[PDB]
Amino acid sequence: HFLCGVVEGFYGRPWVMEQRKELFRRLQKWELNTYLYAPKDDYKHRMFWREMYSVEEAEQLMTLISAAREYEIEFIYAISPGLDITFSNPKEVSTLKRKLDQVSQFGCRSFALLFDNIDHNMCAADKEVFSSFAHAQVSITNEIYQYLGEPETFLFCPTEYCGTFCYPNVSQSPYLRTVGEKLLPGIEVLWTGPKVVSKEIPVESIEEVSKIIKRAPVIWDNIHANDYDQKRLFLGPYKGRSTELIPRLKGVLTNPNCEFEANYVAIHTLATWYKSLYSPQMALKLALTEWLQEFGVPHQYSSRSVTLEDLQLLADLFYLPYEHGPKGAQMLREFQWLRANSSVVSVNCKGKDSEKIEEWRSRAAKFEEMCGLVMGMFTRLSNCANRTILYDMYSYVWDIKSIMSMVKSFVQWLGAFRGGLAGEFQRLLPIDGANDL
Amino acid sequence: HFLCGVVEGFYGRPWVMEQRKELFRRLQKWELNTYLYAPKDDYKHRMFWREMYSVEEAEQLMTLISAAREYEIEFIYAISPGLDITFSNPKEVSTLKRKLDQVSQFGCRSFALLFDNIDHNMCAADKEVFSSFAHAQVSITNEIYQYLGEPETFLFCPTEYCGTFCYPNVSQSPYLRTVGEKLLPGIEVLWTGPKVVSKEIPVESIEEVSKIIKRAPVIWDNIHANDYDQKRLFLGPYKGRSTELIPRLKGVLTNPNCEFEANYVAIHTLATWYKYSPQMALKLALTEWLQEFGSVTLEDLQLLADLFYLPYEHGPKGAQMLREFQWLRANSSVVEKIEEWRSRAAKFEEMCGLVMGMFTRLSNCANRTILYDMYSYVWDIKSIMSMVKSFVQWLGCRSHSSAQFLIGDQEPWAFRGGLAGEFQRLLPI
């Protein structure tokens, strides 16, 4: 069957077990079926992948893997040994087997080997044994498949895991030719689309890759991932992927925002898209409408609120990687126009103009009200009762509100170390606002 | 005696109780004595301050207040009712008293009333009873002082809490004149310096404020606060405050970084200063911190601290990379005695390598709690230096190539900041 769900596949602080249980609740609520465990910086997933879990760690994994079963979500355990492993040393191979067995005894029946972002060339001993980097990965992936008894679901993420990472192209890649041929027919292949973060995943691109790897891939979708930029959050709907892909694919797993509570939209809309033909804008409405209920006012026994419009504003400000939501783009166009047409100056060298200065002013007030809606959105969100949500999003909301606050001032006015060192180096690169509207 | 320690006084995710216990450990380890609880976004501290703590909330505060006593750290409970309180309605006043009693029964004997970020506002009904905003605040602050039995430590943070917030200046403020006169002698006054985030706290500025409020203030120090800027972290030493201030002050509480594990340097160096050379204090603190990791070297931490140093200053290795990159960009047009450009480019490209190395070893460390609290910030700097290294490379490879810097369709991280970033670029800052 078709895999649809979430991969916890991002860099940084991983999610905690209470959060993952709440995740399984939601995947079931929305009729998704899969979870792939692959947090890049849970140390025993990648950095110290040889190390067996301690007894108190094992108690938490088995408790987690059983919540997965309790909630009818399939649990796929991933391991990323590609960094420093010697493929031909059988102690390494045995260590990998030992590690998998251990998790299997916690009651896990599905697995994955990830070879994402790693040096293309092996050590000396390995070049001796294997003809290519591809051959080495397959050989151990197959061996491990078989050693585990050819389990229900088994995933392999290649080093050339998207269009732009294929040397020299997708169709003629010796690496992918080798995966297609030698990887055992029951092992599945993860693929992120044309790019690492794909704006669109066109059907023809999936036909093209499927030909060379001899099967339908499972999409690891980075569309809502935000690990690569401190300032970014993605609350927009699943988008750029035709429902026509579903027959051509073995699954879709989203790698979403690091901040757990910020993924309501990202996952609800994936679900909506799975069950459909699909309208991003309508899926967002469904998802925002449902999300609103999760934001209380606090209970009060002594005394002397977030709306749907607030959430719509918030999502349009923190939307998708290649697109702002309509209320965000509107405030942007309007502010550009105001700055451009600020010839309502006292030091005026066009005498004046009645009509053109009435328009500027009129549009400034209208804009100053839009800025108010941002401040209002922040105020009511900080007054909400679900603090877990407030905290997961606080810095992002504060930021936008403070900057809009300063933009409002600046427009009014028309009538320094910020970002820190990183900010200062950034301003000096001349591609700083190179994708701005 | 004299109050020195930490205020948990910032906006955002507050610290958790395990973190606060570990904090009390450290304050004692380093001979600090105080903690002020005032996280802006515990809902019952400020927004819904009338509300009593629930049973499960009360169980956690009692458990926390007793760890404070266990570790010989004084615990001061703050409350920020300034937003919507009616000062003249005695139900409001009673509600405030009810709330304080509740915390006292959790075993807490020290308190504070905060009136920080509030608009010089009275509702009517209040303007009827009280002649000014200042009069109204003191009247309830005094009443509450007395009602609690005039406790050991009691703090009052004024609305005019720093130089730039005093109308029209510090010396002639009717607001502060009124606080100085009518606030009872055993209540203390919190003050953040000339600014909200003070670069320096000069002695004369403290003499000046002490005169008008008729006592020595307790400094709420925002020097290492990072709640106001997503991209900023402060690992530099306590600085800009003369050791001559210590006799002129009733205390110093730092309001430090939101990310708990990032405050080792910020608090160790405060302690060192409480007994001064900033660069020697940093060395003491970085040397001690290195042990808590585990492979990460001292040179790695020195680089990291210099990259994320202080609000008005970068550390020497950071400022150096900056001046050198400015020079390279400025003098690129010559790509006769410009073997110096090339030479300086390679030398710079090696500096960028040390950043990548620092990040690599930090992600391989065994103290994951620390890694996570700082991960975003370290990734960011590494990615940006990585792109700076490229750009310098590209500048050099230009006598043999006329390719664009960005070649074709990019991944989103090439273009930083999102919508916030785009509005920022449109301001002149």
Side-chain angles (χ1 to χ4, degrees), chain B residues 36 76-81 87 96 100 111-116 137-138 140-142 144-145 148 154-158 187-188 190:
Chain B
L36 179 58
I76 314 184
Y77 180 82
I79 197 97
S80 310
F87 287 107
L96 187 54
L100 294 177
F111 305 77
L113 302 183
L114 307 183
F115 299 82
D116 54 29
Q137 287 180 28
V138 283
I140 78 149
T141 306
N142 287 339
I144 295 271
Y145 187 50
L148 284 119
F154 195 104
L155 314 178
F156 165 94
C157 179
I187 303 161
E188 301 297 351
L190 283 155

PDB file of all heavy atoms in Angstrom, chain B residues 36 76-81 87 96 100 111-116 137-138 140-142 144-145 148 154-158 187-188 190:
ATOM      1  N   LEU B  36      15.051  36.258  40.315  1.00  0.00           N
ATOM      2  CA  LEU B  36      13.765  36.968  40.177  1.00  0.00           C
ATOM      3  C   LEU B  36      12.945  36.272  39.085  1.00  0.00           C
ATOM      4  O   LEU B  36      13.392  36.159  37.946  1.00  0.00           O
ATOM      5  CB  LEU B  36      13.974  38.430  39.825  1.00  0.00           C
ATOM      6  CG  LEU B  36      12.766  39.339  39.605  1.00  0.00           C
ATOM      7  CD1 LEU B  36      11.853  39.375  40.817  1.00  0.00           C
ATOM      8  CD2 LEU B  36      13.247  40.740  39.285  1.00  0.00           C
ATOM      9  N   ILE B  76      12.514  35.540  44.383  1.00  0.00           N
ATOM     10  CA  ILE B  76      11.627  36.707  44.369  1.00  0.00           C
ATOM     11  C   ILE B  76      10.520  36.524  43.317  1.00  0.00           C
ATOM     12  O   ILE B  76      10.813  36.315  42.141  1.00  0.00           O
ATOM     13  CB  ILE B  76      12.412  38.003  44.106  1.00  0.00           C
ATOM     14  CG1 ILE B  76      13.673  38.038  44.990  1.00  0.00           C
ATOM     15  CG2 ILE B  76      11.507  39.236  44.301  1.00  0.00           C
ATOM     16  CD1 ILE B  76      14.480  39.332  44.880  1.00  0.00           C
ATOM     17  N   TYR B  77       9.269  36.610  43.756  1.00  0.00           N
ATOM     18  CA  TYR B  77       8.112  36.402  42.897  1.00  0.00           C
ATOM     19  C   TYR B  77       7.700  37.733  42.358  1.00  0.00           C
ATOM     20  O   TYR B  77       7.355  38.606  43.134  1.00  0.00           O
ATOM     21  CB  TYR B  77       6.909  35.773  43.632  1.00  0.00           C
ATOM     22  CG  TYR B  77       5.721  35.563  42.705  1.00  0.00           C
ATOM     23  CD1 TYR B  77       5.654  34.438  41.876  1.00  0.00           C
ATOM     24  CD2 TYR B  77       4.702  36.508  42.600  1.00  0.00           C
ATOM     25  CE1 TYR B  77       4.580  34.245  41.011  1.00  0.00           C
ATOM     26  CE2 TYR B  77       3.626  36.315  41.730  1.00  0.00           C
ATOM     27  CZ  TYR B  77       3.575  35.185  40.943  1.00  0.00           C
ATOM     28  OH  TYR B  77       2.527  34.991  40.068  1.00  0.00           O
ATOM     29  N   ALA B  78       7.692  37.885  41.030  1.00  0.00           N
ATOM     30  CA  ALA B  78       7.206  39.131  40.425  1.00  0.00           C
ATOM     31  C   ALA B  78       5.805  39.000  39.815  1.00  0.00           C
ATOM     32  O   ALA B  78       5.381  37.929  39.404  1.00  0.00           O
ATOM     33  CB  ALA B  78       8.204  39.661  39.419  1.00  0.00           C
ATOM     34  N   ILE B  79       5.108  40.124  39.765  1.00  0.00           N
ATOM     35  CA  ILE B  79       3.773  40.214  39.195  1.00  0.00           C
ATOM     36  C   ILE B  79       3.692  41.542  38.420  1.00  0.00           C
ATOM     37  O   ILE B  79       4.164  42.584  38.894  1.00  0.00           O
ATOM     38  CB  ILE B  79       2.696  40.075  40.324  1.00  0.00           C
ATOM     39  CG1 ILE B  79       1.302  39.744  39.793  1.00  0.00           C
ATOM     40  CG2 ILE B  79       2.611  41.310  41.185  1.00  0.00           C
ATOM     41  CD1 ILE B  79       1.038  38.249  39.878  1.00  0.00           C
ATOM     42  N   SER B  80       3.118  41.484  37.227  1.00  0.00           N
ATOM     43  CA  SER B  80       3.042  42.629  36.316  1.00  0.00           C
ATOM     44  C   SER B  80       1.581  42.860  36.014  1.00  0.00           C
ATOM     45  O   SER B  80       1.042  42.273  35.076  1.00  0.00           O
ATOM     46  CB  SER B  80       3.861  42.363  35.037  1.00  0.00           C
ATOM     47  OG  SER B  80       5.173  41.914  35.369  1.00  0.00           O
ATOM     48  N   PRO B  81       0.917  43.680  36.850  1.00  0.00           N
ATOM     49  CA  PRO B  81      -0.489  43.972  36.686  1.00  0.00           C
ATOM     50  C   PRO B  81      -0.787  45.269  35.941  1.00  0.00           C
ATOM     51  O   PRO B  81      -1.969  45.643  35.803  1.00  0.00           O
ATOM     52  CB  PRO B  81      -0.949  44.107  38.130  1.00  0.00           C
ATOM     53  CG  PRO B  81       0.178  44.831  38.750  1.00  0.00           C
ATOM     54  CD  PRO B  81       1.410  44.258  38.104  1.00  0.00           C
ATOM     55  N   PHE B  87      -6.540  50.990  39.617  1.00  0.00           N
ATOM     56  CA  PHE B  87      -5.804  51.201  40.858  1.00  0.00           C
ATOM     57  C   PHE B  87      -6.722  51.569  42.021  1.00  0.00           C
ATOM     58  O   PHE B  87      -6.462  51.141  43.150  1.00  0.00           O
ATOM     59  CB  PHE B  87      -4.714  52.274  40.696  1.00  0.00           C
ATOM     60  CG  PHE B  87      -3.510  51.827  39.878  1.00  0.00           C
ATOM     61  CD1 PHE B  87      -3.300  52.297  38.564  1.00  0.00           C
ATOM     62  CD2 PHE B  87      -2.560  50.969  40.431  1.00  0.00           C
ATOM     63  CE1 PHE B  87      -2.192  51.898  37.835  1.00  0.00           C
ATOM     64  CE2 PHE B  87      -1.443  50.569  39.696  1.00  0.00           C
ATOM     65  CZ  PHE B  87      -1.260  51.031  38.408  1.00  0.00           C
ATOM     66  N   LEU B  96      -5.188  41.312  43.857  1.00  0.00           N
ATOM     67  CA  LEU B  96      -3.718  41.313  43.848  1.00  0.00           C
ATOM     68  C   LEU B  96      -3.170  40.715  45.146  1.00  0.00           C
ATOM     69  O   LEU B  96      -2.275  39.869  45.120  1.00  0.00           O
ATOM     70  CB  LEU B  96      -3.188  42.740  43.609  1.00  0.00           C
ATOM     71  CG  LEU B  96      -1.679  42.947  43.387  1.00  0.00           C
ATOM     72  CD1 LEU B  96      -1.093  42.096  42.278  1.00  0.00           C
ATOM     73  CD2 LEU B  96      -1.374  44.434  43.165  1.00  0.00           C
ATOM     74  N   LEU B 100      -0.885  37.253  45.758  1.00  0.00           N
ATOM     75  CA  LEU B 100       0.395  37.229  46.480  1.00  0.00           C
ATOM     76  C   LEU B 100       0.373  36.233  47.667  1.00  0.00           C
ATOM     77  O   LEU B 100       1.294  35.385  47.801  1.00  0.00           O
ATOM     78  CB  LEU B 100       0.794  38.647  46.872  1.00  0.00           C
ATOM     79  CG  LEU B 100       1.112  39.530  45.634  1.00  0.00           C
ATOM     80  CD1 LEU B 100       1.448  40.964  46.039  1.00  0.00           C
ATOM     81  CD2 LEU B 100       2.237  38.944  44.759  1.00  0.00           C
ATOM     82  N   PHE B 111       9.227  39.356  47.004  1.00  0.00           N
ATOM     83  CA  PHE B 111       8.256  39.733  45.956  1.00  0.00           C
ATOM     84  C   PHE B 111       8.678  40.953  45.116  1.00  0.00           C
ATOM     85  O   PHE B 111       9.519  41.749  45.539  1.00  0.00           O
ATOM     86  CB  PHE B 111       6.905  40.096  46.589  1.00  0.00           C
ATOM     87  CG  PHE B 111       6.336  39.031  47.476  1.00  0.00           C
ATOM     88  CD1 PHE B 111       6.835  38.827  48.758  1.00  0.00           C
ATOM     89  CD2 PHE B 111       5.267  38.260  47.040  1.00  0.00           C
ATOM     90  CE1 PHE B 111       6.302  37.858  49.574  1.00  0.00           C
ATOM     91  CE2 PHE B 111       4.712  37.284  47.860  1.00  0.00           C
ATOM     92  CZ  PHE B 111       5.236  37.072  49.128  1.00  0.00           C
ATOM     93  N   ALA B 112       8.043  41.124  43.953  1.00  0.00           N
ATOM     94  CA  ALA B 112       8.201  42.354  43.181  1.00  0.00           C
ATOM     95  C   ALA B 112       6.939  42.754  42.422  1.00  0.00           C
ATOM     96  O   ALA B 112       6.229  41.878  41.917  1.00  0.00           O
ATOM     97  CB  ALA B 112       9.352  42.192  42.230  1.00  0.00           C
ATOM     98  N   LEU B 113       6.658  44.063  42.351  1.00  0.00           N
ATOM     99  CA  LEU B 113       5.651  44.595  41.415  1.00  0.00           C
ATOM    100  C   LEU B 113       6.314  45.299  40.253  1.00  0.00           C
ATOM    101  O   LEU B 113       7.010  46.279  40.464  1.00  0.00           O
ATOM    102  CB  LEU B 113       4.706  45.589  42.051  1.00  0.00           C
ATOM    103  CG  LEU B 113       3.888  45.148  43.257  1.00  0.00           C
ATOM    104  CD1 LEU B 113       2.959  46.291  43.671  1.00  0.00           C
ATOM    105  CD2 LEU B 113       3.115  43.899  42.940  1.00  0.00           C
ATOM    106  N   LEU B 114       6.033  44.829  39.026  1.00  0.00           N
ATOM    107  CA  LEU B 114       6.552  45.397  37.775  1.00  0.00           C
ATOM    108  C   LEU B 114       5.506  46.277  37.049  1.00  0.00           C
ATOM    109  O   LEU B 114       4.405  45.835  36.758  1.00  0.00           O
ATOM    110  CB  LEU B 114       7.031  44.281  36.871  1.00  0.00           C
ATOM    111  CG  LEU B 114       8.038  43.291  37.501  1.00  0.00           C
ATOM    112  CD1 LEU B 114       8.546  42.215  36.529  1.00  0.00           C
ATOM    113  CD2 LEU B 114       9.243  43.993  38.126  1.00  0.00           C
ATOM    114  N   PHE B 115       5.875  47.524  36.745  1.00  0.00           N
ATOM    115  CA  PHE B 115       5.070  48.407  35.905  1.00  0.00           C
ATOM    116  C   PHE B 115       5.835  48.859  34.662  1.00  0.00           C
ATOM    117  O   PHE B 115       5.725  50.015  34.257  1.00  0.00           O
ATOM    118  CB  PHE B 115       4.593  49.607  36.731  1.00  0.00           C
ATOM    119  CG  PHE B 115       3.714  49.216  37.906  1.00  0.00           C
ATOM    120  CD1 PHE B 115       4.282  48.779  39.086  1.00  0.00           C
ATOM    121  CD2 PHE B 115       2.320  49.216  37.804  1.00  0.00           C
ATOM    122  CE1 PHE B 115       3.486  48.407  40.165  1.00  0.00           C
ATOM    123  CE2 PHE B 115       1.529  48.839  38.870  1.00  0.00           C
ATOM    124  CZ  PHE B 115       2.109  48.441  40.060  1.00  0.00           C
ATOM    125  N   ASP B 116       6.595  47.938  34.041  1.00  0.00           N
ATOM    126  CA  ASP B 116       7.512  48.331  32.948  1.00  0.00           C
ATOM    127  C   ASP B 116       6.822  48.948  31.740  1.00  0.00           C
ATOM    128  O   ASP B 116       6.810  50.185  31.635  1.00  0.00           O
ATOM    129  CB  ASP B 116       8.670  47.348  32.613  1.00  0.00           C
ATOM    130  CG  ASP B 116       8.233  45.987  32.327  1.00  0.00           C
ATOM    131  OD1 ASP B 116       7.104  45.830  31.849  1.00  0.00           O
ATOM    132  OD2 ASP B 116       9.036  45.071  32.586  1.00  0.00           O
ATOM    133  N   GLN B 137       0.629  54.114  41.393  1.00  0.00           N
ATOM    134  CA  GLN B 137       1.504  52.969  41.524  1.00  0.00           C
ATOM    135  C   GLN B 137       2.118  52.838  42.914  1.00  0.00           C
ATOM    136  O   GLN B 137       2.142  51.743  43.468  1.00  0.00           O
ATOM    137  CB  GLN B 137       2.634  53.058  40.512  1.00  0.00           C
ATOM    138  CG  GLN B 137       2.204  52.785  39.104  1.00  0.00           C
ATOM    139  CD  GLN B 137       3.333  52.875  38.129  1.00  0.00           C
ATOM    140  OE1 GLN B 137       4.482  52.647  38.482  1.00  0.00           O
ATOM    141  NE2 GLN B 137       3.017  53.193  36.894  1.00  0.00           N
ATOM    142  N   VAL B 138       2.661  53.928  43.453  1.00  0.00           N
ATOM    143  CA  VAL B 138       3.219  53.873  44.823  1.00  0.00           C
ATOM    144  C   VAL B 138       2.173  53.484  45.877  1.00  0.00           C
ATOM    145  O   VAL B 138       2.445  52.648  46.737  1.00  0.00           O
ATOM    146  CB  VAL B 138       3.941  55.142  45.310  1.00  0.00           C
ATOM    147  CG1 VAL B 138       5.326  55.248  44.690  1.00  0.00           C
ATOM    148  CG2 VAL B 138       3.103  56.402  45.140  1.00  0.00           C
ATOM    149  N   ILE B 140      -0.560  51.683  45.737  1.00  0.00           N
ATOM    150  CA  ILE B 140      -0.779  50.242  45.799  1.00  0.00           C
ATOM    151  C   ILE B 140       0.494  49.461  46.139  1.00  0.00           C
ATOM    152  O   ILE B 140       0.407  48.386  46.740  1.00  0.00           O
ATOM    153  CB  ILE B 140      -1.480  49.630  44.549  1.00  0.00           C
ATOM    154  CG1 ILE B 140      -0.551  49.428  43.338  1.00  0.00           C
ATOM    155  CG2 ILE B 140      -2.735  50.400  44.170  1.00  0.00           C
ATOM    156  CD1 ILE B 140      -0.988  48.238  42.511  1.00  0.00           C
ATOM    157  N   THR B 141       1.662  49.959  45.733  1.00  0.00           N
ATOM    158  CA  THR B 141       2.921  49.233  46.008  1.00  0.00           C
ATOM    159  C   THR B 141       3.188  49.254  47.525  1.00  0.00           C
ATOM    160  O   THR B 141       3.491  48.212  48.108  1.00  0.00           O
ATOM    161  CB  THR B 141       4.123  49.798  45.219  1.00  0.00           C
ATOM    162  OG1 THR B 141       3.818  49.836  43.820  1.00  0.00           O
ATOM    163  CG2 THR B 141       5.381  48.941  45.425  1.00  0.00           C
ATOM    164  N   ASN B 142       3.041  50.433  48.139  1.00  0.00           N
ATOM    165  CA  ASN B 142       3.173  50.599  49.589  1.00  0.00           C
ATOM    166  C   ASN B 142       2.141  49.746  50.334  1.00  0.00           C
ATOM    167  O   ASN B 142       2.503  48.910  51.164  1.00  0.00           O
ATOM    168  CB  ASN B 142       3.033  52.086  49.983  1.00  0.00           C
ATOM    169  CG  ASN B 142       4.257  52.911  49.591  1.00  0.00           C
ATOM    170  OD1 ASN B 142       5.352  52.372  49.385  1.00  0.00           O
ATOM    171  ND2 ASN B 142       4.083  54.213  49.500  1.00  0.00           N
ATOM    172  N   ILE B 144       0.589  47.139  49.453  1.00  0.00           N
ATOM    173  CA  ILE B 144       0.919  45.724  49.312  1.00  0.00           C
ATOM    174  C   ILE B 144       2.171  45.346  50.131  1.00  0.00           C
ATOM    175  O   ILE B 144       2.224  44.253  50.712  1.00  0.00           O
ATOM    176  CB  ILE B 144       1.085  45.341  47.812  1.00  0.00           C
ATOM    177  CG1 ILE B 144      -0.260  45.481  47.055  1.00  0.00           C
ATOM    178  CG2 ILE B 144       1.676  43.938  47.614  1.00  0.00           C
ATOM    179  CD1 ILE B 144      -1.163  44.267  47.028  1.00  0.00           C
ATOM    180  N   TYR B 145       3.170  46.238  50.170  1.00  0.00           N
ATOM    181  CA  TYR B 145       4.373  46.048  51.013  1.00  0.00           C
ATOM    182  C   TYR B 145       3.936  45.743  52.434  1.00  0.00           C
ATOM    183  O   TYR B 145       4.291  44.703  53.005  1.00  0.00           O
ATOM    184  CB  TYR B 145       5.276  47.305  51.019  1.00  0.00           C
ATOM    185  CG  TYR B 145       6.628  47.144  51.742  1.00  0.00           C
ATOM    186  CD1 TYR B 145       7.461  46.055  51.464  1.00  0.00           C
ATOM    187  CD2 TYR B 145       7.076  48.090  52.678  1.00  0.00           C
ATOM    188  CE1 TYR B 145       8.685  45.893  52.104  1.00  0.00           C
ATOM    189  CE2 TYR B 145       8.291  47.938  53.334  1.00  0.00           C
ATOM    190  CZ  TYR B 145       9.100  46.832  53.045  1.00  0.00           C
ATOM    191  OH  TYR B 145      10.342  46.629  53.624  1.00  0.00           O
ATOM    192  N   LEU B 148       1.852  42.583  53.320  1.00  0.00           N
ATOM    193  CA  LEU B 148       2.651  41.363  53.404  1.00  0.00           C
ATOM    194  C   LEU B 148       3.604  41.288  54.616  1.00  0.00           C
ATOM    195  O   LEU B 148       4.356  40.295  54.767  1.00  0.00           O
ATOM    196  CB  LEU B 148       3.436  41.182  52.099  1.00  0.00           C
ATOM    197  CG  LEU B 148       2.604  40.674  50.925  1.00  0.00           C
ATOM    198  CD1 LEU B 148       2.525  41.609  49.727  1.00  0.00           C
ATOM    199  CD2 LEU B 148       3.216  39.364  50.452  1.00  0.00           C
ATOM    200  N   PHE B 154      11.706  43.355  48.693  1.00  0.00           N
ATOM    201  CA  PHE B 154      10.550  43.774  47.921  1.00  0.00           C
ATOM    202  C   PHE B 154      10.972  44.778  46.835  1.00  0.00           C
ATOM    203  O   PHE B 154      11.482  45.857  47.161  1.00  0.00           O
ATOM    204  CB  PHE B 154       9.497  44.392  48.828  1.00  0.00           C
ATOM    205  CG  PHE B 154       8.152  44.528  48.171  1.00  0.00           C
ATOM    206  CD1 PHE B 154       7.119  43.659  48.478  1.00  0.00           C
ATOM    207  CD2 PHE B 154       7.915  45.548  47.280  1.00  0.00           C
ATOM    208  CE1 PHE B 154       5.877  43.794  47.877  1.00  0.00           C
ATOM    209  CE2 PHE B 154       6.666  45.711  46.680  1.00  0.00           C
ATOM    210  CZ  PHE B 154       5.649  44.827  46.968  1.00  0.00           C
ATOM    211  N   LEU B 155      10.721  44.439  45.558  1.00  0.00           N
ATOM    212  CA  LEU B 155      11.146  45.262  44.388  1.00  0.00           C
ATOM    213  C   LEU B 155       9.994  45.932  43.618  1.00  0.00           C
ATOM    214  O   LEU B 155       8.933  45.343  43.417  1.00  0.00           O
ATOM    215  CB  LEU B 155      11.955  44.448  43.404  1.00  0.00           C
ATOM    216  CG  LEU B 155      13.055  43.548  43.945  1.00  0.00           C
ATOM    217  CD1 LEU B 155      13.732  42.759  42.813  1.00  0.00           C
ATOM    218  CD2 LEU B 155      14.063  44.360  44.720  1.00  0.00           C
ATOM    219  N   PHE B 156      10.247  47.154  43.156  1.00  0.00           N
ATOM    220  CA  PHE B 156       9.309  47.930  42.353  1.00  0.00           C
ATOM    221  C   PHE B 156      10.001  48.388  41.086  1.00  0.00           C
ATOM    222  O   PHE B 156      10.936  49.166  41.152  1.00  0.00           O
ATOM    223  CB  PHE B 156       8.813  49.111  43.164  1.00  0.00           C
ATOM    224  CG  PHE B 156       8.130  50.184  42.363  1.00  0.00           C
ATOM    225  CD1 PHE B 156       6.758  50.187  42.207  1.00  0.00           C
ATOM    226  CD2 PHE B 156       8.854  51.258  41.860  1.00  0.00           C
ATOM    227  CE1 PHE B 156       6.138  51.174  41.501  1.00  0.00           C
ATOM    228  CE2 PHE B 156       8.233  52.247  41.144  1.00  0.00           C
ATOM    229  CZ  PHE B 156       6.876  52.210  40.971  1.00  0.00           C
ATOM    230  N   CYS B 157       9.561  47.898  39.923  1.00  0.00           N
ATOM    231  CA  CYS B 157      10.083  48.388  38.636  1.00  0.00           C
ATOM    232  C   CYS B 157       9.217  49.477  38.077  1.00  0.00           C
ATOM    233  O   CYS B 157       8.069  49.245  37.728  1.00  0.00           O
ATOM    234  CB  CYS B 157      10.173  47.294  37.592  1.00  0.00           C
ATOM    235  SG  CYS B 157      10.778  47.953  36.035  1.00  0.00           S
ATOM    236  N   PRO B 158       9.764  50.685  37.954  1.00  0.00           N
ATOM    237  CA  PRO B 158       8.920  51.785  37.474  1.00  0.00           C
ATOM    238  C   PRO B 158       8.673  51.732  35.952  1.00  0.00           C
ATOM    239  O   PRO B 158       9.347  50.985  35.208  1.00  0.00           O
ATOM    240  CB  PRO B 158       9.726  53.027  37.840  1.00  0.00           C
ATOM    241  CG  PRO B 158      11.135  52.568  38.010  1.00  0.00           C
ATOM    242  CD  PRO B 158      11.159  51.093  38.208  1.00  0.00           C
ATOM    243  N   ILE B 187      11.364  49.343  50.253  1.00  0.00           N
ATOM    244  CA  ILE B 187      11.094  48.850  48.909  1.00  0.00           C
ATOM    245  C   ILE B 187      12.220  49.339  47.999  1.00  0.00           C
ATOM    246  O   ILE B 187      12.584  50.510  48.032  1.00  0.00           O
ATOM    247  CB  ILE B 187       9.747  49.382  48.351  1.00  0.00           C
ATOM    248  CG1 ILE B 187       8.583  49.019  49.268  1.00  0.00           C
ATOM    249  CG2 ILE B 187       9.497  48.854  46.937  1.00  0.00           C
ATOM    250  CD1 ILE B 187       7.346  49.860  49.053  1.00  0.00           C
ATOM    251  N   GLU B 188      12.734  48.441  47.166  1.00  0.00           N
ATOM    252  CA  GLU B 188      13.813  48.741  46.230  1.00  0.00           C
ATOM    253  C   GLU B 188      13.315  49.069  44.839  1.00  0.00           C
ATOM    254  O   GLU B 188      12.228  48.658  44.449  1.00  0.00           O
ATOM    255  CB  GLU B 188      14.757  47.546  46.141  1.00  0.00           C
ATOM    256  CG  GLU B 188      15.380  47.159  47.464  1.00  0.00           C
ATOM    257  CD  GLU B 188      16.256  48.253  48.050  1.00  0.00           C
ATOM    258  OE1 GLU B 188      16.537  49.265  47.351  1.00  0.00           O
ATOM    259  OE2 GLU B 188      16.698  48.057  49.200  1.00  0.00           O
ATOM    260  N   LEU B 190      14.082  48.979  40.689  1.00  0.00           N
ATOM    261  CA  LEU B 190      14.785  48.357  39.575  1.00  0.00           C
ATOM    262  C   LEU B 190      15.056  49.416  38.504  1.00  0.00           C
ATOM    263  O   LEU B 190      14.234  50.313  38.302  1.00  0.00           O
ATOM    264  CB  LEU B 190      13.937  47.216  39.005  1.00  0.00           C
ATOM    265  CG  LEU B 190      13.937  45.942  39.818  1.00  0.00           C
ATOM    266  CD1 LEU B 190      12.666  45.148  39.562  1.00  0.00           C
ATOM    267  CD2 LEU B 190      15.159  45.131  39.439  1.00  0.00           C
TER     268      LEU B 190
END
